[PDB]
Design a protein around this ligand. Structure first.
Ligand code: HEM
Ligand code: HEM
Ligand SMILES: CNCc1cc(C#N)cc(OCc2ccc3ccc(N)nc3c2)c1
Ligand SMILES: CNCc1cc(C#N)cc(OCc2ccc3ccc(N)nc3c2)c1
Ligand SMILES: C[C@H](O)[C@H](O)[C@H]1CNc2nc(N)[nH]c(=O)c2N1
Ligand SMILES: C[C@H](O)[C@H](O)[C@H]1CNc2nc(N)[nH]c(=O)c2N1
Ligand SMILES: [Zn+2]
Lengths: 409, 413
């Protein structure tokens, strides 16, 4: 059926037909909704229909569906699956597939940019040193001296599952976290486990609050190897406040390049277990989640102190006051250093325009409201009032288990 | 359906196990291929439709009082069955009516205030026959629930639906709300949310003061008759002028709000019976007023005026002037209610209590249905603990349901 979504602020109604293309599960049923669960829920015979589905939509996308080239490609793919139990994507298909995985990412508010994505084909890589080289080139290209450019680097696809390429880091650039004898945590508590693994593998830790972690890289199923990203490639921003001259004394900083490296890219039944991709930050990612989550840097209290807020009662909203000032500081700092960043107002506005585009040209846009709405000031952004339909389309980015929970050394 | 579904809190690592979902009775709108979790809303019961709905409820009631399978249980079942058989409907006992109302609240997945569910004063108004009688019942409810600022949660329940042509309805969406008036120039005075209802009241004979905070009259329908207008005695309507602890100028904005949130357009379903007029009230979470009522673009929309008075740079969005003003407005609302000793709860306290409530429900009841999209507050979401809490949404009965606006269905006499 045709499904309608309404914006309750503007009363705009859009009609979704694109959901009729989904063949993957969301996790919900008729009787239970799992919309707020973070992670709900080949063979030759499994592989060909997936391959075919994808080749078909590619040839449909370039308006040569049912052409000689299309027919020929299907036959070529079939033979390849027969003789080798898999197949290799064309360069054009790899690029189409990676852009569409981003386009289909229901949780991403930045998708208006989806067709501007620099794709680096790294399928000829064989060793962790090669992975390191490719990742350095990615970081340098994407960073671009502060004028950030969206990019993805794609390593060889899974074969038997015993020879996976994996970036063990959850992001290319992250700060270490250390357990202290007195029970507290220095640096980023999110990365304590990963940090311990690096240390055991031989990394010499500086034991600071913002130590850039080394890369831990796994090629062809072999044991992962450590590498230090050259420091001149790691762009960072000291956080200061435009009004509070004391804010810089907090000693806060962050890195300019958000580069998620732990997801799995699926295109046409093929699985790319190492596919680091990066765009640029939305301010709240750092200012709200990274700095203010209780389980992260958890800085609200320190900031509220310097602001001399009365922190005795929750109803003083001292947390909300400090939260805004911290996010002002992050935006101000990235902007002053000419490092690309977007605020949550601008970002969500662009997303609404994006949805409108996709409904017109594509018949819809899968979107996860739980993730799209920013972690602060929700209802003063336009996405809060926008009904969204969430459904799964392929190509897609997927969660995968942490490699230390699967790897035999 | 798997017997055990786990939910996780990503902040605390606490894992809860839900079995109560197996008792789900209605559809969510989601399917295996699509989720409609952010969709706002995704001729009577026949005898044969009514029997099993009633039995399900009666069984649940007797199981709750630890008399399942008892002689009193079996006799009640037989008496209900005979009544349906001979009259096509049945009447709830007062005990069942109270239990039913409390459980509709306990089951309301969108409600963050449910730690309070068992403390609900239930007013049985099933003897009511006229709009004047409805008015009397509603005045008493307002006075009791208000309690001079020490608010007490309450529900008043009018006669259930019969053939669908004799419905009792409160035409208001809440017992107390402010009028809205569309001007010839396109601007709106008062609350733009209530323009349609206000126009209906005016057509019915209401004489509007045409101010910014005019308390609307009650428009009350009894036994399917045409609705009738009444003015709530102003001494029954507790209001709070909004001021700020730091900004002396804030009072000069002339804002105020009413103390009692009393939703009156929902339908209460118990054992297949339909109570189309069941106004209920609790007390406010501050963000309901300070974020939504005041700062929604389609409501009072005061952010700009406050920002100006705060002397903020409103030229770029990235100065976060809107966010800054929004916090000060919510501080003012909480400060003003607490100063006037009118019950209100801030979003940090409310969400913290809800997590405690949910954990208790998982332990005593096997689960707690919750709609994350509604439970997470409209400001500062991720610094409240509910943001980090996985939830399962499903529909249990008794329940509060949406129903069509009565002016769209009413057959004018
Ligand atoms: C260009 C600027 C971009 C912006 C401003 C942006 C913004 C965001 C934000 C704020 C989130 C939520 C992240 C979180 O809360 O952890 C997100 C999620 C996501 N983004 Fe984007 N993004 C951008 C580019 C990209 C690119 C280039 C890709 C892939 C090629 C991508 C793929 C994804 C995916 C797969 C998720 C969801 C991950 C998950 O399910 O856990 N994004 N995005
Ligand atoms: C006692 C203090 C209470 C508090 C603090 C509270 C809090 C809330 C809040 C903040 C919402 C979201 C409202 C919105 O965004 O429009 C809500 C929704 C709701 N509440 Fe409660 N509530 C309370 C009492 C009650 C009572 C007494 C009942 C019924 C007997 C009730 C039933 C509901 C229902 C059915 C919804 C969902 C309404 C809808 O889907 O449109 N609540 N509550
Ligand atoms: C650990 N928090 C949940 C999470 C898990 C995974 C995985 N696997 C990826 C995630 O991706 C977040 C993400 C992904 C892509 C982004 C692109 C740009 C940007 N600014 N942020 C972006 C943020 C998030
Ligand atoms: C148009 N706004 C959405 C909406 C629709 C309906 C209906 N029908 C009811 C609604 O109820 C909101 C509600 C219900 C009960 C409450 C109890 C206490 C409280 N503080 N707020 C409370 C708020 C909301
Ligand atoms: C439990 C809940 O689903 C979880 O905390 C989600 C909520 N929404 C989110 N939204 C974004 N953008 N990022 C997140 O990590 C989360 N976390
Ligand atoms: C489109 C979206 O479902 C809609 O704006 C919802 C979002 N969450 C909400 N949450 C609450 N508490 N109240 C609301 O009115 C809404 N509106
Ligand atoms: Zn769902």
């Amino acid at each position: 059926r045709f499904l309608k979504v309404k914006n309750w602020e503007t009363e705009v109604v859009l009609t979704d037909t694109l959901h009729l293309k989904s063949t993957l599960e969301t996790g919900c049923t008729e009787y239970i909704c799992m919309g707020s669960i973070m992670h709900p829920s080949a063979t030759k015979d499994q592989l060909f229909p997936l391959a075919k589905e994808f080749i078909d939509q590619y040839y449909s996308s370039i308006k040569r569906f049912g052409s000689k080239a299309h027919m020929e490609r299907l036959e070529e793919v079939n033979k390849e699956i027969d003789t080798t139990s898999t197949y290799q994507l064309k360069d054009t298909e790899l690029i189409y597939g990676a852009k569409h995985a981003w386009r289909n990412a229901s949780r991403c508010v930045g998708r208006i940019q989806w067709s501007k994505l620099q794709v680096f084909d790294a399928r000829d890589c064989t060793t962790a040193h090669g992975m390191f080289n490719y990742i350095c080139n990615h970081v340098k290209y994407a960073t671009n001296k502060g004028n950030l450019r969206s990019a993805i680097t794609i390593f060889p696809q899974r074969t038997d599952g015993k020879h996976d390429f994996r970036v063990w880091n959850s992001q290319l650039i992250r700060y270490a976290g250390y357990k202290q004898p007195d029970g507290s945590t220095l640096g980023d508590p999110a990365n304590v486990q990963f940090t311990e693994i690096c240390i055991q593998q031989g990394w010499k830790p500086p034991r600071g609050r913002f130590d850039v972690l080394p890369l831990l890289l796994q090629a062809n199923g072999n044991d992962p190897e450590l590498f230090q990203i050259p420091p001149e490639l790691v762009l960072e921003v000291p956080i200061r406040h435009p009004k509070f001259e004391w804010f810089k004394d907090l000693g806060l900083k962050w890195y300019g390049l958000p580069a998620v490296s732990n997801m799995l890219l699926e295109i046409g039944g093929l699985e790319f277990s190492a596919c680091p991709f990066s765009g640029w930050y939305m301010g709240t990612e750092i200012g709200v989640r990274d700095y203010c989550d209780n389980s992260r840097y958890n800085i609200l209290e320190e900031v509220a102190k310097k602001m001399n807020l009365d922190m005795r009662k929750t109803s003083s909203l001292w947390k909300d006051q400090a939260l805004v000032e911290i996010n002002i500081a992050v935006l101000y700092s990235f902007q002053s250093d000419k490092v690309t960043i977007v605020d949550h107002h601008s970002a969500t506005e662009s997303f609404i325009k994006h949805m409108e585009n996709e409904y017109r040209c594509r018949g819809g846009c899968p979107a996860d409201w739980v993730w799209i709405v920013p972690p602060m000031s929700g209802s003063i952004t336009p996405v809060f009032h926008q009904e969204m339909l969430n459904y799964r389309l392929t190509p897609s980015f997927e969660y995968q288990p942490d490699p230390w929970n699967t790897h035999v050394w």
